Amino acid sequence: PHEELQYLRQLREILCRGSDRLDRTGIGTLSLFGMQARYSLRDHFPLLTTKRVFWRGVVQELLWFLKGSTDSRELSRTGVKIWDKNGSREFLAGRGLAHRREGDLGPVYGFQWRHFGAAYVDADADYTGQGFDQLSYIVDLIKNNPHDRRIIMCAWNPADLSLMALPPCHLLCQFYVADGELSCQLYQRSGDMGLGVPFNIASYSLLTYMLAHVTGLRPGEFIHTLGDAHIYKTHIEPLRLQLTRTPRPFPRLEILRSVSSMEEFTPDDFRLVDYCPHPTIRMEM
Amino acid sequence: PHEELQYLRQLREILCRGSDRLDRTGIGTLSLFGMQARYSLRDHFPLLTTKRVFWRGVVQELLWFLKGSTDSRELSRTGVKIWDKNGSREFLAGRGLAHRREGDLGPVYGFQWRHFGAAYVDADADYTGQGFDQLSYIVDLIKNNPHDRRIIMCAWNPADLSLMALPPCHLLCQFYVADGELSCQLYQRSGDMGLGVPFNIASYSLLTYMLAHVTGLRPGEFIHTLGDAHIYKTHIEPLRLQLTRTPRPFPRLEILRSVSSMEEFTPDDFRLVDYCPHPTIRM
Ligand SMILES: O=c1ccn([C@H]2C[C@H](O)[C@@H](COP(=O)(O)O)O2)c(=O)[nH]1
Ligand SMILES: O=c1ccn([C@H]2C[C@H](O)[C@@H](COP(=O)(O)O)O2)c(=O)[nH]1
């Protein structure tokens, strides 16, 4: 069966037996707790096809994370605007972080990944050598101790929550090496099935391809584990539309160049081959 | 179907198609990566039955960590010895932490749960108002903002790993409130299917029972998520024997009095009703 059907089945399960609860946004959601799906990376790339996924966003955001940035202006410069609402001086003021310059998200993914446990100053500070560099950590383990059971990168630092524009949803990833293949499991505490989850599958699938490339391994599987998997009430009509669509065969992902380091990737290094999605489905928020 | 059949099926899959790997110290496991099982908490308590689980150890260990202890002696004094090897001066010297007094495990679970991000000194220090109290954090959310999607308690602090006797296996738990019920998902990065996992299921199921009690909710589901799920090769034969056993009905768990704080439970507050496991197996 087409692997996209897991996601579509999860949509149906939530619609059909999800709990109706008033959430933070006050829009209301239907939700289930605890889900898991499995996506092969060996012969294709799991970029969902029953709607067009914002691939350009997926690529730029991950490279932005990987270099340790916490500056939304830095992502915005590449034309990807998805963090700009959260980086505005207005939004930050609303969070009780009015002292921040425009763009300073606080110690979000980039900072946690490259400097876990360091004291955050601002987005312009030099954090060289400060905190625990989890990216170096996992690459070293994958290369030199591939069967280790602690190949983890974690973004959840509760001591840093009050400094963050938003608390992370992707709590950690774990990697696993067997038979020359690299696999990845993501624990995501909160998944907006409508706008978030297809994008998120793509992000960590991409990360796995990049790590596999850099470490001389082939991509294996991506395992997506969800906590609160939910559908916003405002998404019920477009998602019912999406549920009428049959998945197309997944595309392939090609890396166009030998890249020696996780930090040396650029968007021009990737080629998506035969991505043929159904049309974009607009959904509110 | 009996929910323990999930665990037994997981055992079977690993023995059938698990990957055969040696670590950098030369020991072999069969493993699979990425697993998930669900245990109902409503009508019974999921203490596994095809081999006896060390319930007395499960209870004392959890109470010990909830009060923020990183002192193995405090656990040992209760008659539960499962952390004593790790807290021995020889073990800590083997870890590169020979300065430690006997019992000082470093910033393991107790410290991460009650003082995340604080600077660890030693097991005897007073850390009041230091770091992030995740236990108070999640109790407050469950009570006052039950639909919050950030009800997290995390034990994985990479900056602290070098100070710990052993890195945590149970990286985080998340809680969920729906229709008067409290559910819990554990992310476990590494599960010894033979010796560890049944104990681990009991631990977080009990934790959910306690939090539900304190917050006036009913226990719902425990979702167990595994990363590296493995069987040590030396365990394969006794596990083949265990796999011939039919699960017996799960016991029930009763809490004997009204307890209003997660820190006020004692082992006497818990009655395990009709736990009839098959005999323990020598692994
Ligand atoms: O990468 C992301 C980021 C956000 N969200 C969604 C999930 C929630 O609907 C919302 C975040 O809200 P909280 O869970 O923090 O309340 O955004 C995702 O699905 N994926
Ligand atoms: O609560 C625990 C603690 C440990 N283990 C097992 C898993 C591994 O076999 C071993 C820990 O070794 P590492 O994964 O840290 O290498 O102990 C468990 O199953 N449960």
Numbering used by the authors:
A (entry chain A): 51 to 335
B (entry chain B): 51 to 333
The authors write:
TS is an essential enzyme for DNA replication. It catalyzes the transfer of a methylene group from the cofactor 5,10-methylenetetrahydrofolate (mTHF) to its substrate 2′-deoxyuridine-5′-monophosphate (dUMP) and produces thymidine-5′-monophosphate (dTMP) and dihydrofolate (DHF). KSHV encodes functional thymidylate synthase (kTS), which shares 70% sequence identity with hTS. The overall structure of kTS was found to have a similar structural conformation to hTS, except minor differences in ligand binding site and conformational variations in some amino acids.
Although co-crystallization of kTS protein with ligands was unsuccessful, binary and ternary kTS structures were obtained by soaking apo kTS crystals with dUMP and/or raltitrexed. Three Arg residues (Arg199’, Arg200’, and Arg239) of binary and ternary kTS structures had direct contacts with the phosphate group of dUMP, which were consistently observed in other TS structures. The loop region (residues 71–79) of apo and ternary kTS structures was shifted away from the phosphate group, and the subsequent Arg74 residue was tilted out; on the other hand, the Arg74 residue of binary kTS was coordinated around the phosphate group of dUMP as observed in other TS structures. However, the loop region (Arg71–Thr79) containing Arg74 in the binary complex of kTS had a similar orientation to other TS structures. In binary complex of kTS, this C-terminal region was well occupied around the ligand binding site, but it did not contribute to a closed conformation. The C-terminal region was observed in the binary kTS structure, but with an open conformation. As calculated above, the distance across active site was over 18.5 Å in other TS structures with an open conformation, including rTS, binary kTS, and vTS structures; however, a shorter distance of 17.9 Å in ecTS demonstrated a closed conformation.
